Amino acid sequence: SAAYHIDEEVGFALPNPQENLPDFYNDWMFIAKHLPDLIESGQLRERVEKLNMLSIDHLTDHKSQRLARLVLGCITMAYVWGKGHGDVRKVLPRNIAVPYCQLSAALELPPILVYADCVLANWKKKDPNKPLTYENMDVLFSFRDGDCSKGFFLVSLLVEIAAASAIKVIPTVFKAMQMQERDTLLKALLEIASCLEKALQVFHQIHDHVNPKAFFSVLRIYLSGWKGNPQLSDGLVYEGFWEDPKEFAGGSAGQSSVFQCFDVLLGIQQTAGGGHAAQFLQDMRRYMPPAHRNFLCSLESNPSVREFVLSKGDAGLREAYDACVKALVSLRSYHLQIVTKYILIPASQQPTGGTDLMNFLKTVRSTTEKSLLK
Ligand code: HEM
After folding, report:
1. Are 259 and 328 within 8 A, CB to CB?
2. Are 236 and 98 in contact (CB under 8 A)?
3. Cα(6)–Cα(13) distance, integer angstroms
4. Which positions ≥6 away from 2 have C-beta within 8 Å?
5. Residue 260 CA, closest ligand 1 atom number
6. Alpha-carbon dihedral sign for residues 294, 299, 300, 301
7. Looking at residue 59, what DSSP letter applies?
8. How far is the centre of ligand 1, averaged over its atoms, from the C-alpha of 125 (Å)?
């Protein structure tokens, strides 16, 4: 749906992201485009600290604000984490923190790099006349040489793009229920499951483009936040904007709207409960663009697909409904192998609670498989 900033082609991802800010913002852009060099040489913090404060007034459209959020988000992670080996900063200087906080308040996102910045808005086609394939795409920003950010961001992006093909069927589903069109609804469900199965294959590409040590020991350090982090146990001081430090979670992949989109579509009850899984999942919506926050809530408000399928004593409908449910399980099962490869093992070889992170993921999967109708 157009009202919810959902693209037919790229889904939750931002269509054709802007690459240039107005010349007014060059001092930001130059720092962001040169993070690998500036961090390596140990100059990044000096360059940030001698920035003047630039007003956000000259950002004139949504895409401009998205790019500015990406630029400032990347500079922030780099400033806080520096070279990525424990020498941190607890005060984001006034001349970044104030405009970053104002912009974030206008976009209804927290002042930290999130998935919608470093993945959904961080990309370009190399040649626009060619399709959305890895070898024709690129990211706009990276942190360090050899951080594998192009691989992680683009493959996450390509999964979002694959899911878009299922997302665009969702309106067909609800109207089918409202028009009592049994065959249309069944075809629609099968199509969604098929597209979700194609999204699972896209996920396999991460092995070709992301290397585990680089991810765990470099990229993951720059995507880390300051909520419950002993390195910044009190959060980050956004100097000149809030007096006391604030805590925000790191820009994980867990901020995608794709799994939750189909959770609520299928009536899978992840957000219900007091447990640590519901709270974490519901907390992650805070980090999704407000338009996508609204989309998930609208879906939660429409009549239940699950109640519809169970009401009709239709084996065809249940089997198609289940095909969607299983594809969602398969995604989470595969995603679990990915976390094992890219976090658990590299951590075990010395450096992510380990077991408490896995049970969370296993819980969400288990909750998902329990929803099968059989
Ligand atoms: C190297 C690849 C990846 C790693 C290491 C990774 C890591 C993680 C981690 C650690 C969590 C637990 C919560 C947290 O981050 O604190 C998580 C959950 C999650 N991840 Fe990823 N992720 C990766 C790729 C992806 C991709 C590509 C997607 C989506 C396209 C994704 C979607 C999710 C979702 C939705 C959750 C929340 C749990 C759920 O909905 O079932 N992840 N991931």
Report:
1. yes
2. no
3. 8
4. none
5. 40
6. positive
7. -
8. 25
